[PDB]
Amino acid sequence: EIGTGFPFDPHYVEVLGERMHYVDVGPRDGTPVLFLHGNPTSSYLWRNIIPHVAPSHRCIAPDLIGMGKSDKPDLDYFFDDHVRYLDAFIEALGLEEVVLVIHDWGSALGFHWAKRNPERVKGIACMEFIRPIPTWDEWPEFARETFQAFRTADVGRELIIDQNAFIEGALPMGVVRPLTEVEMDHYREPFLKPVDREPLWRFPNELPIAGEPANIVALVEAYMNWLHQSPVPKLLFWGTPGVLIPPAEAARLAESLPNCKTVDIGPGLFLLQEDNPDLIGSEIARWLPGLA
Ligand SMILES: CCOc1c(C)cc(C)cc1CNc1nnn[nH]1
């Protein structure tokens, strides 16, 4: 009863010499809602959320470079590669003011973009977003050994690239209900060839955990500082027990982030969109009219 289909016409735009695929539905003009997915997903992640928003608002949901149906350039796929390509995607569409609905590395992208263009963002809805993790102590045990293994050049690449462990292992573990084979196949699709799994490996290696990578730590601290100061309307979805944003961190953020409404989505881990897309979509639709 959670839709497995992806009923959106493909759109492609030429960005820095590569084609990037994106969803584009709703009204053809006006403030768009920009959906940014993270690892190891694609615009597919928003398939059940978009239909709640698209009646009233243009919806745009790109596949990040090297992911989903986007082209696969021979890049190192650092977070900085993702920044360059998303910045260029936004301009290629000539987007002006936007609302962001962001998740995971998409949240790192969203917040980083919002910090650099504060006058162009009308609101931010986020869930399970990237914040600095001071120590492995704070990383949930059930996945601690796994992610520490991910974050090596030898064992980590063997797991993620050669064994597709991020897709076959971490993905379904990040969802409370069991993903169906049909859903898994949509998610496996961009990564059928081991060669195409570079971004899947570099991404966990970019997580700001115990002060490394230093450049990502400083960058994520900068947008966290910007968030605690910014009057931008915020909608924060959180699950129980959650992974990146546990119930107690949500509660704190509700107080320390200005203009921040929170929504309890019930049981949830990493991919909150795969556990309760109905409430996330409906709560976004309810939130939008209050923006403008
Ligand atoms: C407990 C670990 O949580 C995760 C779980 C449980 C599943 C997935 C797919 C991802 C993560 C982590 N998020 C992530 N790793 N690299 N880029 N984003």
UniProtKB/Swiss-Prot annotation:
Listed InterPro entries: AB_hydrolase_1, AB_hydrolase_fold, AB_hydrolase_sf, Epox_hydrolase-like, Haloalkane_dehalogenase_2
Single GO MF descriptor: haloalkane dehalogenase activity
Pathway noted in the entry: Xenobiotic degradation; haloalkane degradation
EC number: 3.8.1.5
Transmembrane residue ranges: none
A Pfam family the protein falls into: Abhydrolase_1
The protein's enzyme class: hydrolase
Quaternary state and interactors: Monomer.
Record-given protein name: Haloalkane dehalogenase
Lineage: Bacteria, Bacillati, Actinomycetota, Actinomycetes, Mycobacteriales
